[model samples]
Target: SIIRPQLKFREKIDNSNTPFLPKIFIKPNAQKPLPQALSKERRQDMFAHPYQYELNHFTPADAVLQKPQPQLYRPIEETPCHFISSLDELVELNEKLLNCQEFAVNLEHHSYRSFLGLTCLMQISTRTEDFIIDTLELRSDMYILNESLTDPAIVKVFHGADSDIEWLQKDFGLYVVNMFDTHQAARLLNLGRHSLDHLLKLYCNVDSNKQYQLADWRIRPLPEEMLSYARDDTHYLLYIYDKMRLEMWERGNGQPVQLQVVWQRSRDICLKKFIKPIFTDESYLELYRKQKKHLNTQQLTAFQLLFAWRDKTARREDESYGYVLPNHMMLKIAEELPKEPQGIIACCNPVPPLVRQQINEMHLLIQQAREMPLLKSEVAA
Candidate 1:
């Protein structure tokens, strides 16, 4: 009797120029496995090695504006918030985190109200400890730990991670890989409440009072209270993953829970974009196009230019759009077909006499905006 190697057939290959994936090897003389016959270990091997599958994140791009609402933090009872203020401390923190398999992450940033937008702080937490990395003090030094975030071997968890990912990449050129987002998990599990505050209450017994959500993260010598608040935001997130995943699994009728990440193809790494990160609606229509029902054809055409004008002016002046011509007010300008300087001034609500006097610029922009026929689009139904 001789033992011959049983033949295993090649099923198929999907050619998509996808990233690295592990080869699928079937068992000797095994017929195509049935769904139920697929054991946990075999399925998990697939999940564990995303490097092994031609799976798609398949979610597509931001395609939509993901601007975060103003920071209004809920309070958590402080145990001991470690404020890492020096380079030595930063080194120590990174060393500690390198040993952790999974950790919690959060970021605080500013946007110009009249003026206030930049990443200010990075909050990191292990299962039992919390640390605040002062972007203000360590902006230059923070690069040392980029591997701690982007390494696929370490799982970085977050809540409502959209803007956090953008600003981190923008300011520091850092990216997160192998990330798990709780907010996305909540949505997948079909939970009625997905906000961080809601999940904290359910899973971590914490209340996030919205006192400092809007605090200027750029300020140095941050108050201990503020540091503690930031620490709490992320400290419990890793723990919450354990609870939620089990609950998510049970919610699936005793089936195991797979850590299906959003935008899996990128593995939650924020891609570098040449343009500043801004989340507009994912629709093809520009901002002005949305108000087409309220606007006539001329207004629609004018509004597009006005929209373009607003962005240019904001970028040129280095101010927020609201600080210049608030978007809502821009529509009124376009819809009103304001031809005079005073008419332009009224579109911006009460303002300084100097601004009111400078209405000629807006008038020119309005005309220039109209001439750009390329800005026109088919009417939205």
Candidate 2:
């Protein structure tokens, strides 16, 4: 309830800067000198969360509520799927989409390897054609799609677009306007299953291949199966939107207000700004609370210190939190209070590579915690 008010209702477009997609860290700006641009930590922070690097000072703009009505959706077999990799193909595709009244979009992203995840692939479907865009190659040029994406004249259909909206902003500097989210529509209609797979089965009698749902999309030459699977994501999305919208209209006795609720919710999702993850002084306490581990003052001190170390390493190495040290292992190390290299290794099963390499540093951190004084609680209830 407290978070409701803090939620932003303004739609923001962040496309001023040239697209910079770095594999591990942010690319250095040509204007900034070596002293200002050489820091890897700074690059990682900016790449992970660009909003803080270059703040958007413009006033919030009102969301576009007027969306184009859905036209007749072509069958899956009737539409040809085109792969857009080069800028020329992308521009041609953009031209086609600009003429379209409605289209469907979906994205596949990966977060396990990097500090902040990367959007690997984007699928776009118009009534007569399906497009698979190689976001990695055209990361900078993808802003061209903003013409149709942010246009109030076109209707963009997505399923469960909460995170997709943020990913688009983070990777391609894109924004959505006049959007419809099928997941929100499912919830509004009280559908038992809200997944895109279920919607495809229910509305179009097509089955989604669940096997490749989590497959890594970063593969240079994506397998044919993966390509086909990607196309299926948005192939029937608009048709499903048509079916779901009719369901909502029928359930509401042909009232238009019921449909407005979905549009309002989708707009709210599009307004969400992607913020960088930073570790604060009290940030460890949040992990401590979730851990539910009973530790003495010394153990708690070690845990907090180790938590800080994990964040530092993750930011420096451009690795994920779990890749550096899993929460459970961090708690174990703190609980054991490893004073030596062996102890650190003994406490962690299948030790993390970083822990082994920096065993001495880990030992010193634990020793420092051991030498610290304890904290007294005002009341132990």
Candidate 3:
């Protein structure tokens, strides 16, 4: 059986290595100086255009224009809270998710880089309780998506669920069955703006500054302020959801619109898995045919040979194929097709050593290609 990795938090550490034996605190570095070219005056001048300044002044008639507010359906009292620090915690969380009738779930990931990045945090909250699961510390065996959790009967609420679903699929192979996206709901409702903060302010009266929007979550001993900020993001999310639901209902729009959007996003994230290739088969054929358009069979052969040599050389050197021998140079060589090394070198703009060494290979491929039967439909005057 394959085991899945789990997230971890910082444990108790000794303070013996500290300068003072009582407490050990490390303060963050001060902000660095700006570049001379990007001086304050220059930056100000960049935004000094009248149209640019006017663009910032337009306002929508909504009170929740840029801030988050409490919605009408949210509960007035404080909700319950749940914190899980291990695999057992995740299993317990999953069980709770299965049993709950309706819940709000949000995921946080460190996505600065896709290939070498980790899903650092997973936050899931219900009306009363919120859980922040650390993804870096746990073993894989602890968390499993049982059938009960994915049952259509249970509603899994989310905001902008597509990217979240894609991230889960890529990281944990988990698929969400039933989901309600608040962001999508807001878009449908024509609420002030669909951003979480704006919705929160419009419906919940909450203000999220997002000062550390790009903070690195992988750091150990997370700050209390950061934890509070993270908890606040989802704590009020469920409240906002309830409020938004009422507004949607009041507007007399049925669930069909919401369902359509959610289904489209869910299917798009889970089912559509085709990745476009960098270069297709047709591209190579097009390149060959295009060169053949302007040259005779012999010159076209030389062009193909030069193109092939350049391609292989680029691959071998781990550089761009066009960097060594550009298409224009290849076309020039095809037009000239010099017989001697000096003539070939002279025909090229400035033949680099690597390209020079492969001239023999280029000459051979050109000779071979010239003898092959040209397509009847592909001939040019």
Best-to-worst TM-score order:
2, 1, 3
In terms of lDDT, model 2 sits at 0.73
Taking the tens digit of each residue's C-alpha lDDT, what string does model 1 give over 1-381? Answer: 211111111222122223322222222112233233234356544313222221122232231112212222323444456877678999899888889877888998876532224567889988667788876566556656665765555677888787786666445545565567888878777788989998989776778977889876656567877877788788778767667666655565654433343335235344422133352322324554556565555676676666666555555444566766666676677778776767777776665333454467668867764554442463442
Clashes of each: 17, 0, 27
Over 1-381, each residue of candidate 2 has an lDDT whose tens digit, in order, gives 112110121322222223443222322221222233424576634343322222122121222222324455677678887888889999999889889877899998876556767688999998888999988777777767776776656778999999998888777667677688999989998888999989988987887887887876777688888988999999889888877777776677766566778877877777776665655536655667667747777888898889888887776665678888888898888888877779889988889888888888888899998887766661252
301: Cα error in model 3, Å: 22
Better of 1 and 3 by lDDT: 1
- In order, the Cα lDDT scores of the candidates are 0.59, 0.73, 0.53
Estimated TM-score per prediction? 0.62, 0.76, 0.51
Candidate 3, residue 132: the lDDT equals: 71
The C-alpha stretches of model 2 lying farther than 4 A from their native spots are 1-78, 279-293, 373-381
Question: How many collisions between residues are there in candidate 1?
Answer: 17
Could you give candidate 3's per-residue lDDT for residues 188-248 as a string of tens digits?
7776788888887776677887866777675555576766666777777666665665565
What overall lDDT, based on C-alpha atoms, would model 3 receive against the true structure?
A: 0.53
Q: Pick the lDDT winner.
A: 2
- TM-score, model 3 to reference: 0.51
Specify the poorest-scoring 10-residue window by lDDT in model 3: 21-30
